[PDB]
Design an enzyme around this catalytic site. Structure first.
Site, PDB file in Angstrom:
ATOM      1  N   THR A 109       0.859  -1.219   0.000  1.00 25.58           N
ATOM      2  CA  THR A 109       0.000   0.000   0.000  1.00 25.58           C
ATOM      3  C   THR A 109       0.875   1.242   0.000  1.00 25.58           C
ATOM      4  O   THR A 109       1.703   1.429   0.891  1.00 25.58           O
ATOM      5  CB  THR A 109      -0.937   0.053   1.225  1.00 25.58           C
ATOM      6  OG1 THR A 109      -1.728  -1.141   1.281  1.00 25.58           O
ATOM      7  CG2 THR A 109      -1.863   1.274   1.154  1.00 25.58           C
ATOM      8  N   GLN A 110       0.671   2.086  -1.002  1.00 17.37           N
ATOM      9  CA  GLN A 110       1.475   3.277  -1.200  1.00 17.37           C
ATOM     10  C   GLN A 110       0.586   4.505  -1.290  1.00 17.37           C
ATOM     11  O   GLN A 110      -0.641   4.409  -1.341  1.00 17.37           O
ATOM     12  CB  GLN A 110       2.258   3.169  -2.511  1.00 17.37           C
ATOM     13  CG  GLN A 110       3.421   2.195  -2.506  1.00 17.37           C
ATOM     14  CD  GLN A 110       4.442   2.498  -3.599  1.00 17.37           C
ATOM     15  OE1 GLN A 110       4.527   3.624  -4.114  1.00 17.37           O
ATOM     16  NE2 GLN A 110       5.233   1.492  -3.954  1.00 17.37           N
ATOM     17  N   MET A 115       0.244  -6.419  -3.466  1.00 15.82           N
ATOM     18  CA  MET A 115      -0.336  -5.247  -2.803  1.00 15.82           C
ATOM     19  C   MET A 115       0.717  -4.181  -2.494  1.00 15.82           C
ATOM     20  O   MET A 115       0.646  -3.491  -1.478  1.00 15.82           O
ATOM     21  CB  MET A 115      -1.102  -5.664  -1.541  1.00 15.82           C
ATOM     22  CG  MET A 115      -2.303  -6.549  -1.832  1.00 15.82           C
ATOM     23  SD  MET A 115      -3.549  -5.705  -2.823  1.00 15.82           S
ATOM     24  CE  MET A 115      -4.244  -4.587  -1.607  1.00 15.82           C
ATOM     25  N   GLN A 138      -6.402   4.393   0.076  1.00 16.34           N
ATOM     26  CA  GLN A 138      -5.836   3.010   0.126  1.00 16.34           C
ATOM     27  C   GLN A 138      -5.841   2.396  -1.277  1.00 16.34           C
ATOM     28  O   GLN A 138      -6.770   2.618  -2.054  1.00 16.34           O
ATOM     29  CB  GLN A 138      -6.622   2.131   1.114  1.00 16.34           C
ATOM     30  CG  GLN A 138      -5.781   1.107   1.872  1.00 16.34           C
ATOM     31  CD  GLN A 138      -5.884  -0.298   1.301  1.00 16.34           C
ATOM     32  OE1 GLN A 138      -6.848  -1.016   1.571  1.00 16.34           O
ATOM     33  NE2 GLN A 138      -4.883  -0.706   0.523  1.00 16.34           N
TER      34      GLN A 138
END
Ligand SMILES: *[C@@](C)(CO)[C@](*)(O)[C@H](CC(C)C)NC(=O)[C@H](Cc1ccccc1)NC(=O)[C@H](CC(C)C)NC(=O)[C@H](CCc1ccccc1)NC(=O)CN1CCOCC1
Ligand SMILES: [Mg+2]
Ligand SMILES: [Mg+2]
Lengths: 195, 231, 244, 212, 240, 233, 235, 222
Positions: free
Chosen positions: F1-2, F107, H1
């Protein structure tokens, strides 16, 4: 799973467990036996999360039976209860804990005394003259405080137990389809067929 | 003698005896021939049987639509190495949308065989391979040895009595190299080449095994009645 | 590679014997004799210290007799360092059992597990076996007073009276001669000492060359007491039986 | 879905509908909600289609391996427990399954086990699973007797699914019938609810609330 | 981890470590198994060089694997405990998953599989143990008697013996045991078992152990006096 | 997650008769702050491929390093590294597309939108898109970000389908690209006037143009606009 | 000592060659392939008369369409059979079909050379794998511990293999019926066996497309033995 | 997100005949309200007379097709160039999909070809691997528009024989390849009118014993 009761009298331990298995708005079964024989003189009833209950009970049963074969000897109710408590005490800090509450009724052949242990899913053990799990206790405990005597017979215990079931059937919201009653004494475990 | 117990030990003259003993397993194996022109590359293999009741041991294995090999020696070791080649050819296609070069195929086999000759516990591969293929730089023929040594050639042969076919191809070099746009004639030259390694036995219909790859020809294997043309 | 230097500790001989176990037993046969005698009202453990020096501190010493828990003790014969590894494991195992079942561990269960560890070293791992033989003396409410022995093979057996270490052949004959089933602790004490006194390789048996211990129900009402004898207490019991 | 299975004098009846939905969208009217584990065991499917399909096919592989190793047919008890122990390992991961493992053996006789994705495993005589289970229970309970004939039992199972197909929006399509005997199961046809409803209405005199 | 291949082939095609494990079995005390019409009897030798023993607490030669199956052995005593433990665990595991106790064949197949695994696993030696496994399948009255050995092969026997001087007692059983008519009763089966051990043992005092297994988890061990009565009876009939 | 920090805006491109054109401005934005102005977002691989990248700049610099290492690795044990076994646009794209999809599947994506433009060995034009999700597609015109909304409509007026490609010259195609960049400067709040443009032709090869500016802009009509409705002054 | 995966000077793996000597000590097993089916037969060879011969399991089912006979250190075959059964069922699960006999044999043979310093030694057992599939029909394979497998029209393995193989060379032809093949296995087994052949010390089996893999009863084999003796006396 | 999934739109359609089968799909690729490509094929010839399409999230769809094509390749290597039957392919795809049960491929998958009796076959999958053989199946964005039309015209649902008092159903029968393509073309032109994600082009893959043929038709580009 809902109602499990236990009463220790002079010479025996009596366990009563509800027969209903409910899922959603349907009673799927009305003749379910919520107990397993751990050894000839030790019986465990159980209640809690679906699946976990039976899986846990049978796992304990297998371990105690393994011990019996290995040593050619029956573990005392106190020893079995301690083993069960430790397994639940491990479980509560696992990734997915067993959500199972149990009563362990046994007859100690060395002491010649009946013994009733109440153990919740956290691993909280107590020896009691009478015990219950769930909402059942909120009615039965006060009733047993009044009517229970330590020197009662097995027949007096069954009448005392009938008094509890009647009160539950009167004031409990859910239909639990009666109870299966089992007695643990010096001669082992037997079921009362007409209750 | 005292220096052949395992692959991790050098002899006083600087030899690796376990690698040499693995090389010996190839010499006992049945003969197989490889040759190419500019348009096509051909594998010819003499298959071997246990007896008249048995089948003939398959010598040729396909690795991709444009590449494949023939074996001589321990067949299970060829299965391991051919499977590795299949994966490497396949990795090149999925990741880079690119047909694996025949030269890189050789480099990958060399490095896989080498690791088994420098470590304790393991053993060298006991098989020799002739890899043919057609890629962006035309037709190719490689010779793999389990010492690790891979060599690109116009033609060659490995196995028992392979010297006869290898001599013939050395004489015929100038002829067969220019067989361009003619599959059947290039095979004929390969069938005549392997015939120089025959003793007492001759090429029959369920004995001979041929494979070809080229410009407008995927890697395909011919067995049974499909090789009756070339006898 | 390293294959060249491997002794192969866990293999069979052509005769079907375990080389290393046999050679470990040969080692143990040179160790100081240790005797265990089981009476109807208790157990005696007697052991001979290995050739003592006069400047050895005797009172604050422990070589032969070790305490596993309040109800179980062991007499050692062989490498002391090896024994202490096993003893700490046995002490831990006893506490695990108590923690799990809220009951003191039955003697055999402790003996079996310790013997199973020894067995492992003879079948797998490529390590040398433990050069140790034990005499287990203990009590539980199932079988009462019990004597066991285990050896490097991991095989254990129960006994009424038994010796390990040096001169066991001679010692076992003497025990077999004078032992009887209705024996008391005080009589067993006398037998243990008399047997060592005759089988010893020393000139004369003295207090400084011995370790002694009893497991009686001599405490107050239905409970077991472990007595590891002090130097002065061994001196007195040696005079009382008329050896010195 | 609506699936049921009940025990009776002549063995076991299994009856299911054939509807599959994605919200209010009717994806299929021809789904096989009874899965044939092997010639002797049936499994019903309710909840996640993939979960039921995949793992009950897997179950058949395990049952086949059992009889290869033990040279004997697997009990319904052992077969159901293999499936229940498997899904219990995946508990919390999000599997969705409500199945009935139905079979007939010598030692057990006709046996039904309800097995579900949260680990429950129940032996019983009658079970109804699915979004229309309550509707099927109503008809089944009021008409069920142990001494039903095979003809009457097959009709009761069919009629109970029809009852649910009618009322439950997420049930319908067609009815698939099965009769399970010791020598194996017998398929008793696919019955389109479209034609079956009108046929039952006329012949039985039921469903007066509907304009015919 | 210790990886060495201890069990390996020799030029003549033998695995010496497995064959030397058989020599360890040959050294062990004699064990005999005889199955009758409605029972199985397991007889076992106990060597008499060990006096001052405590027979209450000393490990018994015959071990219960479950309430309906028993296991005796010949060879290394320490090794046997490992096989017995594994078998007992598998017995409970079978009850848990199949909801039915093990068959005698299944339990034997498992134990034999364990023994075999130790003949081609790195870093381990074979078990110096041969076992006799006997009992009755659940809800079945047909007697079962199986034998295993270090190599991992197993098979069913009408009657069998293992251990030291087993070839002598096998010779006895081969002429005295009739396939067409096995021991009809418990007494007949026990007597034949005691007789066979008396060819080898020495004295019939505290040297012979007998364990009788009957259908529906009915297992009992005989005492000294009970066994001594068979010994006294056989000797009087012998003098003829 | 970025979450992307320093970002690059639109990348636009199209095919023409003999090759492909690709362009992108030289800005590295830090949110609303127009932080870095000397950022090159077109990266050539060999003499036949140009990779245009938008999105996170730290991830762009990582991809630069991968492509640079890819050229090195391809040269190893490869005598034909500058000939038959040289890197093709299709090889370079598939590699990146594999990486992007693997990273999204863990992810932990590379927060980018990429367009690989080039000419194959057989002369065929190559133009394909890939993004942080691993989604891939090809079209006569391709654009990222705002370019997808504003440039594509303009470029599709020139090359609306496959048959319009042979009819489109390099002069006409470049004119359309340069016009599109002007429109993006008018209307994209995270765009700059300065940009780079690259042409890959099957005949004339790779032409890389740096330090271009948007010009011929229309702003004069602004003086006539007063108020927001009623106001006359 | 010396390494487990060592080559001899002649170019063979010592341990593989030594395992082949163990297989020669094993009991005889014979297989014959026909257009009507494949027949598999074995010598039981009980070590003592007290041993119940029906418990000797040297013929084994892998799937409904594949059977297996063994010879050598038979204990080693258990994990090979376990693998084969799993491979066969797993393929059916992945592909909703029967698995080819050749592909099954290849899967088993992949285990063979997975030994060294993986398991500690090669297998000391040879397998005859017989089966049927839609593509190549009735097949018989000989799987060795070398990792090699040959397809055979007929094949014998074990102590009396070289004598039995020479006999199969003469007797086999492409038009053999199933009944003719059954008798031929019994005939050749009786020739090479030490003790006299009967229904208790020998076992027959077959695999057909219609009925699948079947081990014959002792009653059925006994009649084929009686039919065999009568036919030899008839000329 | 970060959201690992996306919707690339499009719709697909598989119909099975007596001795043939078709698998159609529009060539439009989209994200939100933008068009990415007017011609981006998503129906593929995978070999062994099997055609396949995985509609929904294109990245997952491309990965699946790529993996299945690779599965076919290795099936030949491991099983002596045996032809992969349509039913065997279906079961294999179930395992590919269910292998990611806890991080699914967001696609509706359809395959078409011929069964082992030579008859037309269509199989459809949900995102996690549940599959079923059918005569008819529409998948994707406009599946809800197309599918009930197919029920009516292919399987003749709700259609009764004239004059029979709604007692006799219209009889089921196989359609010709010509009649099927008419239904496919009309299905897609109707879907194009009423669904914004459907348009640009239509590519049909027809499968017979002779092989795999292609047909292309223009659709409205608005
Ligand atoms: C009655 C009919 C209703 O419960 C029965 O219970 C039936 C039993 C039959 C189907 C075996 N159950 C269903 O029909 C079941 C209802 C359901 C759905 C999801 C969870 C629990 C119960 N339906 C499904 O499972 C459908 C079957 C399809 C229509 C063939 N599948 C889906 O809804 C799929 C996958 C759902 C899913 C499950 C687990 C993890 C992730 C997803 N979803 C889609 O197809 C959605 N769409 C597909 C096209 O691509 C975009 C996504
Ligand atoms: Mg409805
Ligand atoms: Mg539009």
């Amino acid at each position: 799973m809902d109602i499990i009761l236990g009463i220790r009298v002079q010479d025996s331990v009596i366990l009563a467990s509800s027969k209903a298995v409910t899922r959603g708005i349907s009673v799927l079964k009305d003749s379910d036996d919520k107990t397993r024989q751990l050894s000839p003189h030790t019986l465990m009833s159980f209640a809690g999360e679906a699946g976990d209950t039976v899986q846990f009970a049978e796992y304990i049963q297998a371990n105690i039976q393994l011990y019996s074969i290995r040593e050619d000897y029956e573990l005392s109710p106190q020893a079995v209860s301690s083993f069960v408590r430790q397994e639940l005490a491990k479980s509560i800090r696992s990734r997915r804990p067993y959500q199972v509450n149990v009563l362990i009724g046994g007859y100690d052949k060395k002491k010649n005394k009946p013994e009733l242990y109440q153990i919740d899913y956290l691993g909280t053990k107590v020896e009691l003259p009478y015990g219950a799990h769930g909402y059942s206790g909120f009615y039965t405990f006060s009733l047993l405080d009044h009517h229970y005597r330590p020197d009662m017979t097995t027949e007096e215990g069954l009448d005392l137990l009938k008094l509890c079931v009647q009160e539950l059937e009167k004031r409990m919201p859910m239909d639990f389809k009666g109870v299966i009653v089992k007695i643990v004494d010096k001669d082992g475990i037997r079921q009362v067929d007409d209750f | 003698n005292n220096y052949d117990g395992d692959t991790v030990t050098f002899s006083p003259t600087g030899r690796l005896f376990q690698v040499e003993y693995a090389l010996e397993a190839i010499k006992q194996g049945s003969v197989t021939v490889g040759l190419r022109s500019n348009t096509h590359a051909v594998l010819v293999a003499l298959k071997r049987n246990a007896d008249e009741l048995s089948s003939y041991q398959k010598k040729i294995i396909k690795c991709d639509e444009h590449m494949g090999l023939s074996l001589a020696g321990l067949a299970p070791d060829a299965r391991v190495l051919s499977n590795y080649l299949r994966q490497q050819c396949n990795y090149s296609s999925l990741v880079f949308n690119r047909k694996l070069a025949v030269e890189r195929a050789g480099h990958l086999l060399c490095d896989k065989a080498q690791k088994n000759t420098q470590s304790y516990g393991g053993r060298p591969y006991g098989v020799g391979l002739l890899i043919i293929g057609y890629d962006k730089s035309g037709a190719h023929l490689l010779e793999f040895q389990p010492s690790g040594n891979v060599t690109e050639l116009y033609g060659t042969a490995i196995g028992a009595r392979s010297q006869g076919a290898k001599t013939y191809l050395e004489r015929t070099l100038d002829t067969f190299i220019k067989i361009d746009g003619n599959p059947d004639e290039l095979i004929k030259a390969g069938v005549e080449a392997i015939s120089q390694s025959l003793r007492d036995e001759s090429l029959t219909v369920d004995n001979l095994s041929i494979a070809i790859v080229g410009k407008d020809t995927p890697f395909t294997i011919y067995d049974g009645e499909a090789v009756a043309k070339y006898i | 590679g390293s294959r060249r230097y491997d002794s192969r500790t866990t293999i069979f001989s052509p005769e079907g014997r375990l080389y290393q176990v046999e050679y470990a037993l040969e080692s143990i046969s040179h160790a100081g004799t240790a005797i265990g005698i089981m009476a109807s009202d208790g157990i005696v453990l007697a052991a001979e210290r290995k050739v003592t020096s006069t400047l050895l501190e005797q009172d604050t010493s422990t070589e032969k007799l070790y305490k596993l828990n309040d109800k179980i003790a062991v007499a050692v014969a062989g490498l002391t360092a090896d024994a202490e590894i096993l003893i700490n494991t046995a002490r831990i195992h006893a506490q695990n059992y108590l923690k799990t079942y809220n009951e003191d561990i039955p003697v055999e269960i402790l003996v079996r597990r310790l013997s199973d560890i020894k067995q492992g070293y003879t079948q797998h791992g490529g390590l040398r076996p433990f050069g140790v033989s034990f005499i287990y003396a203990g009590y539980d409410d199932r079988y009462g007073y019990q004597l066991y022995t285990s050896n490097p093979s991991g095989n254990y057996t129960g006994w009424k009276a038994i010796s390990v270490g040096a001169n066991t052949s001679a010692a076992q004959t003497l025990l077999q001669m004078d032992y009887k089933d209705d024996m008391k602790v005080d009589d067993a004490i006398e037998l243990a000492l008399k047997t060592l006194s005759k089988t010893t390789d020393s000139s004369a048996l003295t207090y400084d060359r011995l370790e002694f211990a009893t497991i009686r129900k001599g405490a107050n009402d239905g409970e077991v007491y472990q007595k590891i004898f002090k130097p002065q207490e061994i001196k007195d019991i040696l005079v009382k039986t008329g050896i010195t | 879905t609506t699936t049921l299975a009940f025990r009776f004098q002549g063995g076991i009846i299994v009856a299911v509908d054939s509807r599959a939905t994605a919200g209010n969208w009717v994806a299929s009217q021809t789904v096989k909600a009874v899965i044939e584990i092997n010639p002797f065991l049936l499994g019903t499917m309710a909840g996640g289609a993939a979960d039921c399909q995949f793992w009950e096919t897997w179950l058949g592989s395990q049952c086949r391996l059992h009889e290869l190793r033990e040279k004997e047919r697997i009990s319904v008890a052992a077969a159901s427990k293999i499936l229940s122990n498997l899904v219990y390992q995946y508990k919390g991961a999000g599997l969705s399954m409500g199945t009935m493992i139905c079979g007939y053996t010598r030692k057990e006789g006709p046996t039904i086990y309800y097995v579900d994705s949260d680990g429950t495993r129940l032996k019983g005589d009658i079970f109804c699973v699915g979004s229309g289970q309550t509707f099927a229970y109503g008809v089944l309970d009021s008409n069920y007797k142990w001494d039903l004939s095979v003809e009457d039992a097959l009709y009761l199972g069919k009629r109970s699914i029809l009852a649910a197909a009618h009322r439950d929006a997420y049930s319908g399509g067609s009815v698939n019938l099965y009769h399970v005997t010791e020598d194996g199961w017998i398929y008793h046809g696919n019955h389109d609810v479209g034609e079956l409803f009108w046929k039952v209405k006329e012949e039985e005199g039921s469903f007066n609330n509907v304009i015919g | 981890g210790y990886d060495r291949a201890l069990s390996i082939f020799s030029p003549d095609g033998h695995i010496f470590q497995v064959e030397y494990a058989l020599e360890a079995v040959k050294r062990g005390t004699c064990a005999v198994g005889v199955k009758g019409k409605n029972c199985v009897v397991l007889g076992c030798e106990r060597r008499s060089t060990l006096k001052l023993q405590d027979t209450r607490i000393t490990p018994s030669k015959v071990s219960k694997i479950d309430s309906h199956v028993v296991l005796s052995f010949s060879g290394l005593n320490a090794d046997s405990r490992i096989l017995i433990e594994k078998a007992r665990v598998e017995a409970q595991s079978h009850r848990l998953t199949l909801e039915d106790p093990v068959t005698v064949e299944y339990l034997t197949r498992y134990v034999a599989g364990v023994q075999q695994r130790y003949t081609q696993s790195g870093g381990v030696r074979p078990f110096g143990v041969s076992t006799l496994i006997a009992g009755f399948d659940p809800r079945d009255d047909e007697p079962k008697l199986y034998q295993t050995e270090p190599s991992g092969i197993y098979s069913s026997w009408s009657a069998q013996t293992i251990g030291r001087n087993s070839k002598t007692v096998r010779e006895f059983l081969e002429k005295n045991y009739d396939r067409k008519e096995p021991p009809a009763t418990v007494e007949e089966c026990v007597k034949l078992t005691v007789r066979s051990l008396l060819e080898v043992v020495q004295t019939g005092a505290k040297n012979i152990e007998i364990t009788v297994v009957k259908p529906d988890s009915d297992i009992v061990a005989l005492s000294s006096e009970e066994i001594n009565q068979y010994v006294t009876q056989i000797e009087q009939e012998k003098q003829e | 997650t970025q979450q992307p920090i320093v970002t690059g805006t639109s990348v636009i491109s199209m095919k023409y008769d003999n090759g492909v054109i690709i362009a992108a401005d030289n800005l590295g934005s830090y949110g609303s702050l127009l932080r870095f102005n000397g950022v090159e977002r077109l990266i050539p691989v060999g003499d036949n491929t140009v990779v245009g990248i938008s999105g996170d700049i730290s991830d762009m610099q990582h991809i630069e390093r991968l492509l640079k290492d890819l050229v090195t690795e391809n040269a190893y044990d490869n005598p034909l590294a500058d000939a038959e076994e040289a890197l093709e646009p299709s090889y370079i794209f598939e590699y990146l597309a594999t990486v992007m999809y693997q990273r999204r599947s863990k992810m932990n994506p590379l927060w980018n939108a990429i367009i690989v433009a080039g000419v194959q060995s057989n002369g065929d034009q190559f133009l394909r898109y890939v993004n942080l999700l691993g989604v891939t597609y090809s079209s006569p015109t391709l654009a990222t970000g705002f370019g997808a909304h504003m440039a594509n409509p303009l470029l599709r007026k020139v090359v609306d389908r496959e048959s319009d490609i042979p009819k489109t010259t390099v002069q006409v195609a470049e004119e359309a690209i340069v016009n599109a960049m002007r429109v993006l400067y008018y209307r994209d709040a995270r765009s700059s006037r300065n940009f780079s443009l690259a042409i890959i032709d099957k005949n004339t090869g790779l032409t890389f143009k740096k330090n271009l500016q948007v010009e011929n802009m229309k702003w004069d009509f602004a003086k006539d606009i007063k108020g927001y409705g009623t106001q006359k002054i | 000592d010396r390494g487990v995966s060592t080559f001899s000077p002649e170019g063979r793996l010592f341990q593989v060659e030594y395992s082949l000597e163990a297989i020669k000590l094993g009991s005889t097993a014979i297989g014959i392939a026909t257009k009507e089916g494949v027949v598999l037969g074995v010598e039981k060879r009980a070590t003592s008369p007290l041993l119940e011969s029906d418990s000797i399991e040297k013929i084994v089912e892998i799937d409904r369409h594949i059977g297996c006979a063994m010879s050598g250190l038979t204990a080693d075959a258990r994990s090979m059979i376990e693998h084969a059964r799993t491979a066969a069922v797993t393929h059916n699960l992945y592909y909703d079909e029967d698995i080819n006999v050749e592909s099954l044999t290849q899967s088993v043979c992949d285990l063979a050379l997975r030994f060294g310093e993986l398991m500690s030694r090669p297998f000391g057992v040879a397998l005859l794998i017989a089966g049927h599939d839609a593509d190549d029909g009735y097949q018989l394979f000989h799987a060795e511990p070398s990792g090699t497998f040959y397809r055979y029209n007929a094949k014998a393995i074990g102590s009396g293999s070289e004598g039995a193989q020479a006999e199969l060379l003469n007797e086999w032809h492409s038009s053999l019926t199933l009944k003719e093949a059954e008798l031929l296995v019994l005939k050749i087994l009786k020739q090479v066996m030490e003790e006299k052949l009967d229904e208790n010390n020998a076992q027959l089996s077959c695999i057909t497309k219609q009925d699948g893999f079947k081990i014959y009863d002792n009653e059925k084999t006994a009649e084929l033995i009686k039919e065999l003796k009568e036919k030899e006396a008839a000329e | 997100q970060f959201n690992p999934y996306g919707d690339n739109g499009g719709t697909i359609l598989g119909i099975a005949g007596e001795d043939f089968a078709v698998l159609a799909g529009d060539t439009r690729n989209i994200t939100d309200y933008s068009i990415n490509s007017r011609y981006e094929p998503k129906v593929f010839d995978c070999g062994d007379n099997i055609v396949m399409s995985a509609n929904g999230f294109a990245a997952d769809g491309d990965a699946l097709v790529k993996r299945f094509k690779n599965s076919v390749k290795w099936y030949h290597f491991d099983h002596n160039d045996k032809k992969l039957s349509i039913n065997s392919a279906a079961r294999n795809i179930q395992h590919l999909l269910y292998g990611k049960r806890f991080f699914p491929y967001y696609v509706h998958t359809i395959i078409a070809g011929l069964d082992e009796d030579g008859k037309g076959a269509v199989y459809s999958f949900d995102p996690v691997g549940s599959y079923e053989r059918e005569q008819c199946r529409a998948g994707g964005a406009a599946a809800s528009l197309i599918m009930p039309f197919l029920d009516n015209q292919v399987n003749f649902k709700n259609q009764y024989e004239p004059g029979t008092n709604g007692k006799v159903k219209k009889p089921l029968k196989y359609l010709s390849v010509e009649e099927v393509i008419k239904l496919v073309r009309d299905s897609f032109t109707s879907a194009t009118e009423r669904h914004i994600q459907v348009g640009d082009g239509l590519e049909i893959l027809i499968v017979t014993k002779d092989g795999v043929r292609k047909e292309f038709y223009e659709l409205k580009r608005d």
